[PDB]
C-alpha cells in the first residue's frame, strides 16, 4: 500500500536504468535501487550440494 | 556495475584524477569520487577508537 | 601590516563563486538588483563584478599567522 | 535557588537568516536549542543570561550556512542542600506527598520527614495528620493544598541515555522535609 | 597527504583548498555585558577571619 | 552443534585446607597490617577538594595534620613540600 | 556543548524576576512564528516561572532597596547564604530565623535575632 | 584488481555518457553539441528559490518525455520523491514551495 | 603475535555466490581440520 | 521534561593508529563463536544453521532476510564479527620474520 495515499495500485517499474516501485496513482516511491552481482564474480561461482552443506 | 549489456557508468582512471590535480580543483574531484560514488555513513567509537 | 600579493588568485575566484553560488541557491538575499537571471552562478558572477560579495578570504601561512582579506580590496583582473 | 553557569557551543546559522544580526539570531537558535531541558550534572535550564564573546564566522565547504562558536552564560535551577522552598502540593502517595514547584515537579515528602504521631491513613490515599492536644487526627493536607513550607534534604541525577542498539522517570529528583516547626501549611504557624 | 585525502572522502590542501572563508556578517564581538546586581564582588566578605 | 559450557567438570576437586591455631595468628596479623597501613600519612590520600557552598561547619570538622618530612638531608633538595 | 564553570554565581530572584519581565516586553511583540516546539518550551517554561514568582514576597523590590538592606547585614557576620535566604524569603517571625541560621543559639543572641527580624521587617 | 589500484584510488561514477564523435565547425571554441536522447536522461537537482519558481514551475508542467522538463521532485521536508510520469495532475507545480 | 584466535570477516564482505565465496571454503576446512585434530587428540 | 543531548556529533577524522589484537580482545570484539563445518539445515527449507558459518547474526548477504543482530536488511546493515577458537596455537604468515 502506498504510505501516501493508502491505494493499493504499486506497480514495479524501471525508469531508463533505475528500477523502483511507484504508486500508480499519486507518483510516490517507496523503494529504489538494487544491488546485484557483476560478471567479475559471475566467473567465479562453485557449486556446493544442499545434502552436502547438510552434513 | 560495468558493462554496457548491464546498465553501465564510465570510470575516473587513475590518470583523470592526476589531470584533476594537476588543475588544482579540490572539490571537484571530491564530488566526482565520493559524493556520487560511494558516499556511505557510518559510525564510529572514539573511546575504543 | 601585510605581505601576501594583492591580486586575487584563480583559486580564490573559483572557491568564492562556487560558496556564493552555493549560498545563493539556499533562499539567500541577493545583494545587486537581478534582471531577471535565473542560474546562480551568474548571479554570483555578477554580485562579484559589482563587488559586493559579502565573504571575507583569510591566507593561512604555513608558520601559522593569517592575514585577512576582503573580497573588494583584492586585484580582480582577467 | 537559581545558579548562573558558564557554557561553550558552536551555532549554524541558515543562509536566509544572513540579514538580521548575528548577535540576535545566534542567541534565539541556542536559548531554542537549550530552554526547558535539565543538564545531566548542573540541573535545570531556564535561558540564557548573556552572551559574553563571538568567534569568527567560518563558512565551511559543501555548505552554505556559517558556523560559529560562541561563549555565553545560562541560568539554571538547581537548590542548594538544606535550602528551604515553597509549593503547592501535587499529590499523595504511600511513600510520601508529592509537592509540585509550578514548573518542577520531581519533589517528594518521605513518612520519615513527617512528622511522627501520624503515619498512614484510613485506607485514604489522603495524607492525614495527628498531633498531641488539639488536631485531634483530623486535619488531612490537600492534593493540591497552598504553598507549604519545606526544606531540601536529598536530591540525585539518574541518567537516560539509551542502552543497547536503537530500534520515563523525571532525571532529576528531589527530596524534602517537613519535621521541624514552622515547616508544612502555614495556617498550622 | 592527497592520497591519503582522496581515499578517505575529505577536500586535499592545495589548490582551492589552501585558505579559509569567512562570512563578512554585521556583528559586535564582546558586546556589553548584562549587568549584575546582588551579587557584585565588594558585598562578600568571608566570615571565617 | 553446540560449543561446551563455559565451566566443564573437573573431576580432581580442591584439595582440603591445612589449619592451625598459628595460621589463625597470622590471619589476624595480616589483617591488622591491612587495618594500620591506612593511618599515617605514607598513605597519602587524594588532597581534600570541591568545596561546595559557604557552609559553617569547617571551623570544627577541618582535619588538622602536620606537614609530614623525613630527613632531607639523604634525599635531594628538589622536592620541598 | 561544553560547561566551563557549574557555580559561578548565585543570584537573587529579584534579578531573575527583571530578566524574565524584559523577556515579556519582547514576547508578544509580533506574531508568533510557530516553527518548532521550541517557541511552546521557551514560552511555558518562562511562563510558568513567571507565574510562580509572582507569588513571591520579592516582588516589587528594586536595586537600590536592596543594595542598602545588604550593606546593612554585612555587619551582622553571616554567610552570603544566609543572606540570600533572608533576602529571598523575608521572614516574620523569630522560628524560622532560628531554622535559618545554623547554631542560631549559639552564634547569635537574642536581641541579635530581634534586630534581624525588625530589619527584614522595616528594609523591605 | 586489488582494492588500492582498482576501488580506492579511480572508481565509477553515474550521471556519465559515452557516444561516438563528429565535427561540427559551427561552434564557439567552448561548446559541446548534446544529444536530446541524453539530455532527457542526465539530471541536474536544482534548489528552488524565489529566483527560478517560475522558470522550474514551466519545467515540471512540461514532464519527463518533452524535453525542457524534469523526471523528479523531493518535498522540502520530506524525503521522499515523486515520480513524474504517474502525477496525473498539473498541480504539483503549484504546490512547489522554497526549499 | 603468535595467533590462537581468529575474527571471521562479515557476511558483507564475502557475497551469498563466489556456491559460496573461497574464503567460507577455507574457514570450513580450518574448522572442520580443528574438530578432527581435537577428537583424534581425546 | 527530558534530558538534555546534542543532537549534531558530526567529527572528522584526524590520525589512525596501526596496531594488533590480543586474543582475549578479539573474543570481546566477536558476536557468536563459530563451531560446526556445515553450512545449511538438513531440511529443504535451507535456513543456514545456526551456530555454523553462514549463520545471519554475522550479517546477510541476501536480499530478503534480515540480520538478526540488529533488524535491519541488507542495504544498511553495517555486518558484525564472529570468532573461531584454534585448538593448537599457529604462526602468522606476514609476521613471521618479525
Ligand atoms: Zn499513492
Ligand atoms: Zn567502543
Ligand atoms: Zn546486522
Not at chain 4, 512528622?115 to 498531641?132: G, L
Not at chain 7, 524569603?89 to 535559618?100: D, G
Request: a negative charge; one cysteine or more.
Amino acid at each position: 500500500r502506498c504510505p501516501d495515499c493508502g491505494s493499493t495500485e504499486l506497480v514495479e517499474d524501471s525508469h531508463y536504468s533505475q528500477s523502483q516501485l511507484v504508486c500508480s496513482d499519486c507518483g510516490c516511491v517507496v523503494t529504489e535501487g538494487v544491488l546485484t552481482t557483476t560478471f567479475s564474480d559471475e566467473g567465479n561461482l562453485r557449486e556446493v550440494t544442499y545434502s552436502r552443506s547438510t552434513g | 556495475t560495468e558493462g554496457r549489456s548491464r546498465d553501465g557508468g564510465l570510470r575516473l582512471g587513475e590518470m583523470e584524477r592526476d589531470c584533476l590535480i594537476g588543475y588544482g580543483a579540490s572539490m571537484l574531484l571530491l564530488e566526482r569520487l565520493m559524493i556520487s560514488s560511494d558516499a556511505f555513513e557510518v559510525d564510529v567509537c572514539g573511546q575504543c577508537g | 601590516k601585510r605581505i601576501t600579493t594583492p591580486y586575487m588568485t584563480k583559486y580564490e575566484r573559483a572557491r568564492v563563486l562556487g560558496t556564493r553560488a552555493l549560498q545563493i541557491a539556499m533562499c539567500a538575499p541577493v545583494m545587486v538588483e537581478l534582471e531577471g537571471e535565473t542560474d546562480p552562478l551568474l548571479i554570483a558572477m555578477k554580485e562579484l563584478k559589482a563587488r559586493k560579495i559579502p565573504i571575507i578570504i583569510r591566507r593561512y601561512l604555513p608558520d601559522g599567522s593569517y592575514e585577512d582579506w576582503g573580497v573588494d580590496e583584492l586585484i580582480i583582473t582577467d | 535557588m537559581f545558579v548562573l553557569v558558564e557554557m561553550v557551543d558552536t551555532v549554524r546559522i541558515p543562509p536566509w537568516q544572513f540579514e538580521r544580526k548575528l548577535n540576535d539570531s545566534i542567541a534565539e537558535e541556542l536559548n531554542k536549542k537549550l530552554a526547558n531541558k535539565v543538564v545531566y550534572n548542573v540541573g535545570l535550564c531556564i535561558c540564557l543570561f548573556d552572551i559574553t564573546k563571538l568567534e569568527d564566522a567560518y563558512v565551511f565547504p559543501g555548505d552554505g550556512a556559517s558556523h560559529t562558536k560562541v561563549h555565553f552564560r545560562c541560568v539554571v535551577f538547581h537548590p542548594f542542600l538544606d535550602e528551604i522552598l515553597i509549593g503547592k502540593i501535587k499529590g499523595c502517595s504511600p511513600e510520601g506527598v508529592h509537592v509540585s514547584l509550578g514548573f518542577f515537579d520531581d519533589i517528594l515528602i518521605p513518612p520519615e520527614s513527617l512528622q511522627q504521631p501520624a503515619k498512614f491513613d484510613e485506607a485514604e490515599q489522603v495524607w492525614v495528620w495527628e498531633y498531641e492536644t488539639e488536631e485531634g487526627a483530623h486535619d488531612l493536607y490537600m492534593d493540591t493544598g497552598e504553598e507549604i513550607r519545606f526544606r531540601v534534604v536529598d536530591e540525585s541525577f539518574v541518567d537516560t541515555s539509551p542502552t543497547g542498539p536503537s530500534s520515563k522517570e523525571a532525571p532529576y529528583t528531589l527530596v524534602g522535609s517537613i519535621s521541624e516547626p514552622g515547616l508544612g501549611l502555614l495556617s498550622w504557624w | 597527504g592527497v592520497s591519503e585525502c582522496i581515499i578517505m572522502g575529505i577536500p586535499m590542501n592545495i589548490g582551492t583548498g589552501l585558505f579559509k572563508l569567512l562570512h563578512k556578517a554585521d556583528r559586535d564581538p564582546n558586546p556589553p555585558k548584562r549587568p549584575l546586581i546582588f551579587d557584585t564582588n565588594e558585598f562578600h566578605i568571608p566570615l571565617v577571619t | 552443534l553446540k560449543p561446551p559450557p563455559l565451566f566443564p567438570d573437573t573431576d580432581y576437586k580442591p584439595v582440603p585446607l591445612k589449619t592451625g591455631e598459628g595460621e589463625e595468628y597470622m590471619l589476624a596479623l595480616k589483617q591488622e597490617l591491612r587495618e594500620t597501613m591506612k593511618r599515617m600519612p605514607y598513605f597519602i590520600e587524594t588532597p581534600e577538594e570541591r568545596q561546595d557552598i559557604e557552609r559553617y561547619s569547617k571551623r570544627y570538622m577541618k582535619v588538622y595534620k602536620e606537614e609530614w618530612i623525613p630527613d632531607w638531608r639523604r634525599l635531594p633538595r628538589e622536592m620541598m613540600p | 556543548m561544553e560547561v566551563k564553570d557549574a557555580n559561578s554565581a548565585l543570584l537573587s530572584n529579584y534579578e531573575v524576576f527583571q530578566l524574565l519581565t524584559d523577556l515579556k516586553e519582547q514576547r508578544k511583540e509580533s506574531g508568533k512564528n510557530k516553527h518548532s516546539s521550541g517557541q511552546q518550551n521557551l514560552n511555558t517554561i518562562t511562563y510558568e516561572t513567571l507565574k510562580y514568582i509572582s507569588k513571591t514576597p520579592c516582588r516589587h523590590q528594586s536595586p537600590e532597596i536592596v543594595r542598602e538592606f545588604l550593606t546593612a547585614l554585612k555587619s551582622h557576620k553571616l554567610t552570603k547564604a544566609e543572606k540570600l535566604q533572608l533576602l529571598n524569603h523575608r521572614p516574620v517571625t523569630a522560628v524560622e530565623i532560628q531554622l535559618m541560621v545554623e547554631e542560631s543559639e549559639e552564634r547569635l543572641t537574642e536581641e541579635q535575632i530581634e534586630a534581624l527580624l525588625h530589619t527584614v521587617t522595616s528594609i523591605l | 584488481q586489488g582494492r588500492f589500484r582498482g576501488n580506492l584510488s579511480g572508481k565509477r561514477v553515474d550521471f556519465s555518457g559515452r557516444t561516438v564523435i563528429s565535427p561540427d565547425p559551427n561552434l564557439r571554441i567552448d561548446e559541446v553539441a548534446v544529444p536530446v536522447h541524453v539530455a532527457k536522461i542526465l539530471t541536474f537537482p536544482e534548489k528552488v528559490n524565489k529566483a527560478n519558481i517560475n522558470f522550474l514551475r514551466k519545467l515540471v508542467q512540461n514532464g519527463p518525455e518533452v524535453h525542457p522538463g524534469a523526471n523528479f521532485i523531493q518535498q522540502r521536508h520530506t524525503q521522499m520523491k515523486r515520480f513524474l510520469k504517474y502525477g496525473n495532475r498539473e498541480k504539483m507545480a503549484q504546490e512547489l514551495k522554497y526549499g | 603475535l603468535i595467533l590462537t584466535r581468529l575474527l571471521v570477516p562479515p557476511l558483507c564482505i564475502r557475497p551469498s555466490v563466489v556456491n559460496e565465496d573461497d574464503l567460507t571454503m577455507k574457514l570450513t576446512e580450518i574448522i572442520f581440520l580443528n574438530d578432527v585434530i581435537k577428537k583424534h587428540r581425546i | 521534561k527530558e534530558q538534555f543531548r546534542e543532537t549534531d556529533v558530526a567529527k572528522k577524522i584526524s590520525h589512525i593508529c596501526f596496531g594488533m589484537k590480543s586474543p582475549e580482545e578479539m573474543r570481546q570484539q566477536a558476536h557468536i563463536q563459530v563451531v560446526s563445518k556445515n553450512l545449511y539445515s538438513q531440511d529443504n527449507q535451507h535456513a543456514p544453521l545456526l551456530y555454523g558459518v553462514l549463520d545471519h547474526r554475522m550479517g546477510t548477504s541476501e536480499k530478503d532476510r534480515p540480520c538478526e543482530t540488529c533488524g535491519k536488511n541488507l542495504a544498511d546493515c553495517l555486518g558484525h564479527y564472529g570468532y573461531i577458537d584454534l585448538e593448537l596455537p599457529c604462526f602468522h604468515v606476514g609476521y613471521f620474520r618479525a
